[PDB]
């Protein structure tokens, strides 16, 4: 019910359709992920029994971009901590690879302790080797939610 | 654009299937009209036995 | 400006049969139906001209076939029609629905000569109209099911011929096609269709056509959010309005004392809208009183003599909804018996019985 | 297409309620995690029958 | 690939066809209920007037 509801909010976000009886969406997707979105487009209209071919036509407008970040399950939580400041431009350089190693760095040389690097982490490899059935519960205190 | 060769190919469909209900609103009253052929037409078929009785 | 082509009639028909190459036939037959697409006449040679295509050519035999059904529907010296049925068994072969890259252009054919009236009743006397049924079901029907149901809208104009189809599986496979409505012009003539059905119909007999077509079926409740769309042809926006008021009526025509009496006197009555209906019950308060308490006590006959494997939850509907409106009901239920009946009937194995007998005993005792 | 919006919210309204009832009869439900693949419009009758 | 251009000339303009063909016939075949009939409406009604001069 709530992925029938999704395809119709976007669909409200689509074309006024005063062209003619189809639905044209002007859309932001990369150009290194063409090919996969046609070979989900020749699938689309495939399982509505309809032979006529959705096609992708390329723009050169002059509108700003959005940013995307390609990101793993680890290097989430060091890209989201640099957009919590300031969403980087297009195409600009991202410190995320480097904040992955220079910010535990910058917060060992302040908080510096073999006896407190070992509670830290066995407080994290804890979260880590025990998260499949965290992420079986619904949520929890922020004290759990942010920390996780 | 594409959406420039969609909006007047979508004017020419629209066109057709208008001039098609203006001839369904200018036959409307011509099959009347040609049923008033028969006015004309099926008096005769009462001459068929106007010479039979006589 | 087509050069006052008015001569050489038998002529350019010579070149028919004597051609000998297949591209050079097919370009002229193409030629030939380029020209008889808005004219006049210019079908005397044209049956004899059956003879000389329809023959190792495909790219002939469906042009042949579009100067053939537009020659018999324009024209009044062309109207053969004696030959058009015997054509339309020499067709049915090439309307036989096993056909790949050519039922397309066939199924036109079939629609362009059956747009007269007496002429599609020339085809439907010697049809076998399951051929329209057996590309009814899954066969490819993207443009197929618009063209198959576009004959059906021609053939529902003559009122003699409604009840002609009625012999067949016909609306309950055309609700399984409304369910689907992917192209949008394949429901939009069938809704169209519907009302050519039975408005063009002068009989009674479209209660036969109540009964079978959508109280049966899950078309009577698909109207309503048809009608909450917006739809932008004025044609279909005044056809579901057209269609509620009918079947707006039907729904209340349906619901009637005298029905009822015969649902549970002659018998055998399903779950039709009769027993679902909150109108039935709201008015015929006092009827199972009105029958000296004999409406009370047939009910029941028929629960205890018979087993009824299907409709033994019908009747615990019917008592189950009576005692709820009517409080002074459950005083004949408790002098008949009918209340032990009910607590034995509701351990049955088949779910759909257990149900309504649960839903009738807990609806017996509602105050004490 | 505001009409089929909002059946899918009353849809999910009533889904909420039911989601609400199941626990009070204290009933925990499985998962049985796997992706499903989405109802066509087709469907949608079906799904408020 | 440049066939963008062209798959957009060769299957939205297809359904411009079918927007125009496939509609204009059922206005066309709206005949039998605005033409074909409607001759019967004025045809028996002058019927009964041959009738009189029979």
């Known amino acids: ?123 994290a490899v804890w979260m880590v080797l025990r998260e499949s059935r965290i992420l079986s519960q619904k949520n929890e205190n922020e004290m759990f939610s942010t920390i996780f | 654009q594409g959406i420039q060769q969609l909006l007047q190919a979508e004017k020419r469909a629209a066109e057709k299937v208008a001039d098609a209900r203006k001839r369904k609103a200018r036959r409307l009253k011509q099959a009347k009209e040609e049923a008033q052929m028969e006015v004309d037409q099926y008096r005769r078929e009462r001459e068929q036995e106007f010479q039979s009785k006589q | 400006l087509q050069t006052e082509g008015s001569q050489c009639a038998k002529t350019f028909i010579n070149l028919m049969t004597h051609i000998s190459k297949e591209q050079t036939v097919q370009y002229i037959l193409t030629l030939v139906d380029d020209t008889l697409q808005e004219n006049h006449q210019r079908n005397t040679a044209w049956s004899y001209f059956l003879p000389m295509l329809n023959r190792q050519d495909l790219f002939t035999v469906h042009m042949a076939a579009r100067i053939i059904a537009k020659l018999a529907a324009w024209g009044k010296e062309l109207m053969e029609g004696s030959d058009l049925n015997y054509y339309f068994n020499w067709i049915k072969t090439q309307l036989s629905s096993q056909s790949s890259q050519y039922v397309q252009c066939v199924a036109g054919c079939l629609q362009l000569m059956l747009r007269v009236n007496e002429y599609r009743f020339a085809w439907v006397e010697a049809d076998g109209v399951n051929c329209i049924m057996g590309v009814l079901s899954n066969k490819c029907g993207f443009q197929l099911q618009y063209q198959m149901i576009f004959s059906v809208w021609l053939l529902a104009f003559s009122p003699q011929m409604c009840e002609h189809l009625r012999r067949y599986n ?52 698909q109207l309503e959010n048809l009608e909450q769309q917006k739809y932008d042809d004025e044609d279909i926006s005044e056809d579901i309005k057209f269609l509620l008021e009918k079947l707006g009526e039907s729904v209340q025509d349906l619901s009637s004392f005298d029905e009822y ?24 308060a006092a009827r199972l009183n009105e029958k000296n308490y004999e409406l009370l006590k047939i009910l029941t006959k028929l629960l205890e003599v018979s087993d009824d494997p299907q409709v033994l939850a019908v009747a615990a509907h019917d008592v189950g909804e009576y005692v709820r409106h009517y409080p002074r009901g459950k005083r004949v239920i408790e002098q008949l018996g009918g209340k032990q009946l009910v607590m034995n009937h509701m351990h049955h194995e088949d779910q759909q019985v257990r149900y309504n007998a649960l839903l009738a005993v807990q609806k017996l005792m509602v105050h004490n | 297409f505001v009409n089929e919006v909002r059946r899918c919210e009353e849809m999910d309204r009533k889904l909420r309620f039911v989601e609400k009832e199941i626990r009070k009869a204290n009933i925990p439900i499985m998962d049985t995690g796997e992706n499903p693949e989405v109802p066509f419009p087709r469907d949608m009758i079906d799904l408020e029958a | 690939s440049d066939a963008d251009v062209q798959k957009q000339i060769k299957h939205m303009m297809a359904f411009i066809e079918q927007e125009a063909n496939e509609k204009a016939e059922e206005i066309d075949a709206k005949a039998e209920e605005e033409f074909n009939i409607e001759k019967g409406r004025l045809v028996q009604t002058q019927r009964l007037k041959i009738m009189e001069y029979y």
Request: proline share 5%.
């Open chain 1, 1 to 123: 019910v709530r992925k029938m509801k999704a395809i119709y909010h976007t669909l409200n976000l689509c074309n006024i359709d005063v062209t003619q009886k189809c639905l044209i969406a002007e859309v932001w997707c990369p150009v290194t992920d063409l090919d996969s979105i046609q070979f989900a487009l020749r699938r689309g209209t495939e399982h509505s029994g309809s032979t006529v071919p959705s096609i992708l036509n390329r723009m050169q407008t002059n509108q700003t971009p959005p940013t995307y970040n390609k990101t793993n399950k680890f290097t989430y939580g060091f890209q989201n901590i640099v957009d919590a400041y300031g969403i980087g431009t297009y195409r600009e350089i991202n410190p995320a690879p480097y904040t992955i190693i220079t910010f535990p760095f910058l917060f060992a040389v302040m908080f510096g302790d073999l006896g407190h690097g070992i509670l830290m982490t066995l407080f």
């Open chain 3, 170 to 221: 016909i609306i309950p496979v055309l609700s399984d096609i409304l369910q689907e409505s992917v192209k949008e012009k394949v429901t939009r003539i069938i809704l169209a269709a519907f009302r050519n059905f039975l408005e063009k119909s002068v009989e009674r007999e479209t209660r036969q056509e109540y009964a079978l077509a959508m109280i049966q079926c899950k078309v009577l409740k």
């Open chain 3, 261 to 284: 009496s015969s649902e549970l006197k002659s018998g055998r009555l399903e779950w039709s809208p009769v027993h679902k209906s909150e109108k039935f019950w709201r008015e015929n």
